[PDB]
Swiss-Prot record, chains A, B:
Compartment(s): Periplasm
Cited Gene3D superfamilies: Alkaline Phosphatase, subunit A
Cofactor requirement: Mg(2+); Zn(2+)
A GO term from the CC aspect: periplasmic space
Keywords: Disulfide bond, Hydrolase, Magnesium, Metal-binding, Periplasm, Phosphoprotein, Signal, Zinc
SMART domains: alkPPc
GO biological process: protein dephosphorylation
EC number from the UniProt entry: 3.1.3.1
Residues at the active site: C102
Protein name: Alkaline phosphatase
Self-association and partners: Isozymes 1 and 3 are a dimer of identical chains, isozyme 2 is a dimer of heterogeneous chains, one of each of the subunits from isozymes 1 and 3.
GO molecular function: alkaline phosphatase activity; hydrogenase (acceptor) activity; magnesium ion binding; oxidoreductase activity, acting on phosphorus or arsenic in donors; phosphoprotein phosphatase activity; zinc ion binding
Classification via CDD domains: ALP (cd16012)
């Protein structure tokens, strides 16, 4: 096939009150499904990760923006689907820890080995293993690592660094919390240090704050990590304008955009869930966040510029886009922020398939790292956690719930979650797989080693 | 193909602490996946429903019985997967109700039209529509409706009865709660009355208690509903033995097994979740329930005998098996009960595929009606709801949570849930579908109208 079908319109066919008025699929898929099938080697691989975006997150965001009977043009439009396991390993026992953190998970799919919660590219034994990003580069492909969080955060960090603690952001954190990785003690260095040493062609996200540090040793001691980036041939860009002006990025001219002191500003603003908020409080309608500046690139924008620069490589490219704050907002009990963040990720996904569809050799994979606290309860539910009534696009009120923690931060769940793919070797996400399988798939699809 | 591949072993490949030690898929599936594809008409269709068994349910049970790295021989061994929406409609507004109940859902997939919570075979307007069971029978196929709940409960009821309230069990409830259906007022009758009137070839479950009623009018007034069954040519069997002796069931000799006064007994016994149960209480390990009698057929057993009698029809058969109590135990915050019940469903599923695999023309579909309260939180989680620490087959302690209700019953959730199929037209469950599509798939697969 000169192209495989991307899911067209699986949105409710009509009047959801009539027979077949709700149906999503119009015909029998056997054939369409037959066409999506392919083992021709993927030439590019874009992995869009929705941080903590399980099935519950997806439903809730769609319900709100597209309505119950809606369809996500980007997120839902992927023909091949499955569920995958993502548990962690207990550092002392080598036994499962049913609820993984952001790191062990990002490592499982980036190295193909299960690890303890809080590890980045190192196994329970603390030994390092090459990441899919590193292997791609070695094989001469192009690297991209896009995110809305700080680049030091787990998901991005896990493709470019190897530290025993995900807390070893820069120089100091590392000296004390990861003595064994402290560049001055002979370690490879902090997450920030190793990210710059890693040199991926396109690196966009926030977290410029840690570049403020200065090396403790090495060839660039005294020099702020920012200075060293410049000194090493990096193109640093601080806004939409600067990014849009980058006409090329490669190993000679690698681009690094630091669009935020820490985490990038959330798109939608809305109150936080409260105890009995679905009954003592009124219905909520999210609105655009005043804080997010017109100069701070959206996920879809970053996702776009990267595909562009990255697509210049004759050999091909590897790109990880992460809608980071879905997680964070799930953690904060803030439905308007959590949902808006999934909508934002949806756009990036749209651009992924847009490229993927024309190019015809790109494997696009949309999944999350783990499940989160959020639930869609009935309107009159009386829950022990935090709720909130949202006015959805349907005109109907949807109630959300967060009751799995009393500590002031809701939390990750162990349930299996969806994994949707499209393109070459997209077959391998179907059925029940593991978060590590993802890594091996990305390998074979790219014909890597 | 003389047969399509049923998922073999997607259990962790080896030592979950080494590279690829956790992997579930050994190779590239593109081809294997190519082989499962087929539009040759389904000759039989077994629908195995897990009452309230979303992904979270499945993960929890697999962890406890098979270990995190485990694999369900029946539930996970299905090659084609997807996610499907199941929201209900608001009776007054014709708008979505994001959290459907057991009835509206059972109807969405049994009639192909969305309905209000509490309706059975009637739309929001209260008009009746033919069920997939009704259509199969007319077409000359065989009918089988198997369940671990009372036959009067939603899931089974929704294939044989049309009432305005799913509470209209027998003669009396109907007269008052469904005056418009009261046989004496000229209605089609109660759920029990309409079930017997429907005359499906094989009907096994519990709920003998409502047969104790006597008709208020009709040709059999005065006669208990259980006398009328005998009077209409019914084979009533009360235990494992009775059932095992039934050598034939059909329209002339339809079988009706009533194996419990109400709901059938749960398989495993265990305490109920408690406030801070994961910290004040010790680790739980489920044990076999003392109440369950050696004479009461297990789901798999009923599922087996049915496939046997139903498979005698030259034309083919339609069979709906339901692991009813997974739901009820989720509602009860009783982990050991909820998990055990998914284990019990898994076995039936195994028989479903065992048949389906040899026969080669059977479409087997394993899904749930909605998502439920249950969550898998971390060991040291301090939740506002009810938790409980379970000792899983791994050796590790898995903690579960139920915090979406303060009312004394945990409740259904709206998130999309899995839908796994295998065989003819299995393709149609892949991607994102709707609970109503399931009904239309069952139609085309069977070439019905
Ligand atoms: Mg993250
Ligand atoms: Mg049911
Ligand atoms: Zn995460
Ligand atoms: Zn988190
Ligand atoms: Zn249910
Ligand atoms: Zn229920």
């Amino acid at each position: 096939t000169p192209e495989m079908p991307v899911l067209e319109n699986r949105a409710a066919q009509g009047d959801i009150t009539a027979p077949g008025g709700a149906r999503r699929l119009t015909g029998d898929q056997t054939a369409a499904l037959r066409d999506s099938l392919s083992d021709k080697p993927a030439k590019n691989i874009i992995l869009l990760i929705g941080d903590g975006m399980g099935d519950s997150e997806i439903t809730a965001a769609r319900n709100y923006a597209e309505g119950a009977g809606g369809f996500f043009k980007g997120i839902d439009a992927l023909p091949l689907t499955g569920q995958y396991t993502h548990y962690a390993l207990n550092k002392k026992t080598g036994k499962p820890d049913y609820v993984t953190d952001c790191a062990a998970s990002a490592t499982a799919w980036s190295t193909g080995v299960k690890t303890y919660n809080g590890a980045l590219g190192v196994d329970i034994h603390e030994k390092d293993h090459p990441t899919i990003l590193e292997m791609a580069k070695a094989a001469g492909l192009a690297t991209g690592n896009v995110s809305t969080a700080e680049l030091q955060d787990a998901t991005p960090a896990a493709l470019v660094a190897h530290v025993t603690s995900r807390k070893c952001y820069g120089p100091s954190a590392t000296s004390e919390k990861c003595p064994g990785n402290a560049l001055e003690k002979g370690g490879k260095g902090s997450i920030t240090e190793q990210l710059l040493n890693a040199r991926a062609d396109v690196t966009l996200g926030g977290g410029a704050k840690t570049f403020a540090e200065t090396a403790t040793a090495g060839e660039w001691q005294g020099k702020t990590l920012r200075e060293q980036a410049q000194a090493r041939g990096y193109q640093l860009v601080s806004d939409a304008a600067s990014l849009n002006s980058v006409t090329e990025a490669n190993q000679q001219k690698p681009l690094l955009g630091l669009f935020a002191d820490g985490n990038m500003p959330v798109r939608w603003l809305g109150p936080k869930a409260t105890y009995h908020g679905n009954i003592d409080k009124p219905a909520v309608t999210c609105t655009p966040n005043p804080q997010r500046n017109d100069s701070v690139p959206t996920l879809a924008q970053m996702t776009d510029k990267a595909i562009e620069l990255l697509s210049k490589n004759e050999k091909g490219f590897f790109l990880q886009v992460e809608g980071a704050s879905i997680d964070k907002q799930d953690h904060a009990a803030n439905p308007c922020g959590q949902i808006g963040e999934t909508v934002d990720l949806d756009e990036a996904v749209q651009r992924a398939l847009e490229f993927a569809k024309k190019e015809g050799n790109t494997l696009v994979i949309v999944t999350a790292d783990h499940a989160h606290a959020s639930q869609i309860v009935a309107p009159d539910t009386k829950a022990p956690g935090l709720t909130q009534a949202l006015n959805t696009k349907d005109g109907a009120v949807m109630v959300m719930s967060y009751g799995n923690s009393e500590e002031d931060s809701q939390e990750h769940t162990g349930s299996q979650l969806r994994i949707a793919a499209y393109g070459p070797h997209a077959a391998n996400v179907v059925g029940l797989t593991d978060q590590t399988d993802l890594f091996y798939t990305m390998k074979a699809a790219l014909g890597l080693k």
